[PDB]
Subunit: 50 residues, 2 copies
């Protein structure tokens, strides 16, 4: 098309969120509970030491 601004609005409609950024979000939210448990058990060990 020759319509100004049509390309990026159509791209935005086609891709609400990028694939790689969505996968980054997925992997980060998957890793969050593991890091939470790691830090929690580390501080539990610190409490046990004292």
């Amino acid at each position: 098309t020759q319509q100004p601004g049509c390309e990026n609005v159509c791209y935005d409609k086609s891709f609400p969120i990028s694939h790689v950024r969505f996968w980054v979000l997925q992997i980060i939210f998957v890793s969050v509970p593991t890091l939470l448990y790691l830090a929690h058990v580390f501080y539990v060990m610190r409490k046990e030491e004292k």
Copy 2:
């Protein structure tokens, strides 16, 4: 503007009819009664001849 087709629609809005063509219409409609009278009196003369 970069909008396709805006230039000619704006030209059409600005100039509903061209100036020279409007003046041609004016002069032609002004001449019409003169030609009508000329031909009419010519045929009246032809009738008078016979």
